[PDB]
Amino acid sequence: AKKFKVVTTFTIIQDIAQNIAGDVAVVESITKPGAEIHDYQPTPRDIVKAQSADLILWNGMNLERWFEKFFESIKDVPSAVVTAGITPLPIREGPYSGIANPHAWMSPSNALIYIENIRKALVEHDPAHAETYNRNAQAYAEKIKALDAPLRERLSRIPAEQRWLVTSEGAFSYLAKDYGFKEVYLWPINAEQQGIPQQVRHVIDIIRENKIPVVFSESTISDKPAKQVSKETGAQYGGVLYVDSLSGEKGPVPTYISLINMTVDTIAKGF
């Protein structure tokens, strides 16, 4: 009858978890493709959705500023933080300085740890399907491991000194560390905040000093500040990167694997 039901806070976890669950459990996301996840405002239908689940997955590292208050309205549903065991990179400036940068999934090696935490959660709370979860997790982990070589090859045309990654949110720190990029951003983490117009001038100084050819925005936030930066520098606007959300199932970024590939592909294109 009713399959084991998993509810996640946002879409990236949904797709990783669904790959481990296979045909044996149904995984749904509270947030919709394209929606901003950091300061999402849960509605009454989200409570019913989360309350209907057998297990709730969230990122932690205070990604979902809304989750803990929301979860107080949910009774008798176990939850698991899928970043357990990941060493955080701290936010480097702004009013959230020193807090964990929550975007750990942009490192494919960190995704192996996401996968293991989700597998553990599913095996524990749905032990009747532990064998399917264990098989699916190991197969999906191998798919993630197979990304490292093509990803580095795709970025290999860009010499080390020119590997500057200029984005809107500083959401790519884990990806940048993995593939040897230095990061510049217009704001360190999505939030309601001051300091963005002045950071735009500092970034402009950095674009000129280092001859950076391309700046990017992201799929859940406005492209306007990055487009402005491109106008008042030489650098071209390299388009939209994906980090905080997948696209819809027929859009360009329907899976976690496609999010990593398309973000790296768009970066490489921009150079």
Binding residues are 38, 103, 169, 244
Shortest separation between residue 139's beta carbon and Mn ion, angstroms: 29
Return the number of the residue (108 or 137) whose C-beta is nearest Mn ion: 108
Binding of Mn ion by 171 (CB under 5 A): yes
Return the number of the residue (55 or 91) whose C-beta is nearest Mn ion: 91
Return the number of the residue (146 or 191) whose C-beta is nearest Mn ion: 191
Show the tokens assigned to 208. 């000129």
| Cα distances (angstroms) measured from residue 34 to each of 42, 111, 218 | 15, 21, 10
Return the number of the residue (140 or 187) whose C-beta is nearest Mn ion: 187
DSSP label of 104: G
Q: Which of residues 174-213 bind Mn ion (CB under 5 A)?
A: 190
Binding of Mn ion by 64 (CB under 5 A): no
Binding of Mn ion by 244 (CB under 5 A): yes
Shortest separation between residue 29's beta carbon and Mn ion, angstroms: 15
Total of residues contacting Mn ion (CB under 5 A): 4
| Cα distances (angstroms) measured from residue 211 to each of 47, 84, 113, 193, 208 | 49, 39, 36, 29, 5
Shortest separation between residue 94's beta carbon and Mn ion, angstroms: 13
Shortest separation between residue 215's beta carbon and Mn ion, angstroms: 17
Largest alpha-carbon pair distance within the chain?
A: 62
Shortest separation between residue 161's beta carbon and Mn ion, angstroms: 28
Q: Distance between CA atoms of 93 and 85, rounded to whole angstroms?
A: 24
14-22, 118-126, 171-179, 255-263 -> range binding Mn ion (CB under 5 A): 171-179
Q: Distance between CA atoms of 148 and 165, rounded to whole angstroms?
A: 19
Shortest separation between residue 63's beta carbon and Mn ion, angstroms: 7
- The full 3-state SS of 119-177, as one line of letters, equals HHHHHHHCHHHHHHHHHHHHHHHHHHHCCHHHHHHHCCCCCHHHCEEEEEECCCHHHHH
Q: Which of residues 110-169 bind Mn ion (CB under 5 A)?
A: 169
Buried b (16+ CB within 10 A) or exposed e, 228-259: bbbeebebebbebbbbbbbbeeeeebbbbbbb
DSSP label of 22: T
Return the number of the residue (64 or 169) whose C-beta is nearest Mn ion: 169
Return the number of the residue (126 or 244) whose C-beta is nearest Mn ion: 244
Annotated binding site for Fe(2+): 38, 103, 169, 244
Q: Site residues (CB under 5 A) for Mn ion?
A: 169, 171, 190, 244
